[PDB]
Amino acid sequence: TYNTDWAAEKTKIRSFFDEYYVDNEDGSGKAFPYRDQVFEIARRDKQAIVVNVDHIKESDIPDALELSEAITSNTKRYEVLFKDTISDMIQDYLGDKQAPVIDALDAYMFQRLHMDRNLQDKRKKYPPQLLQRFEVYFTTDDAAHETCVRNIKATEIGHLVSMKGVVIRATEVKPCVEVMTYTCDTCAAEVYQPVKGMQFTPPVNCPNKECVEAKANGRLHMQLRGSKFVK
């Protein structure tokens, strides 16, 4: 009684990005603003897309209501599918060109992918949080999702919720770990560990098969030029 065919859902999501439009104010044509924002990410003038679920709900597309309900009911999963479809759209726009290097992690990734050269290998070697470098956020305006702090209870876990309130306390911005990278002493291999939640446990012993078979006992040392941080 569950659906896990991700390719069909990706097809639906990409059809939304292709076919949502707004008419030009002079009547000269149509704007396709979501794919314009995707191309802004592709040329690196941007870092995030904010998607309005009510636009999906009121779009002139088959299965639009079902897609909106699925997004609202399991939002923590559909973020991954939106990131995957935007990554495929970025590669279709970009072609054989390269996106510009702007920071040390971009320089490390662009240098290391061609060191590896000198899709199965890419997706097995690198986690998707490191391969994809943009943010996706959702919004709602319909009053069905309006609630108070008092009303958010056990039925709302995992769902998208909207509310309105006053800010009492706020901290300053801190660096938060997203992906750690370790390198072995003896065999010079690398380990990538993605982090979820507010804790992580670092691995100790090298997992690479040649190092393990040789019993070289190489330690793992963490490196922050390859590791990923977020505000």
């Binding site: 003896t186 040789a214 019993k215 070289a216 006992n217």
Partner: protein, 82 residues
Amino acid sequence: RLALNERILTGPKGISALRETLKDFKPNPKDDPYANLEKLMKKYAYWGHLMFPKMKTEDVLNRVETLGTRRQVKVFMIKHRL
């Protein structure tokens, strides 16, 4: 168990790999002999580290000097000198 032995010493990580490592080494005969010795000794250490990482360079060279008495290694050297 795991130990350095005649299969490893005659295998693709062994004496042929050391020969391939030594092909680029060309000391100057008019230079300091101790300096030339230092240059040679660290190439021995590099080959030993690739060939058997568990053990110190000193113990690796002692084990190679021991294993030279085996008949299999002698037959390998008889073929290899040609």
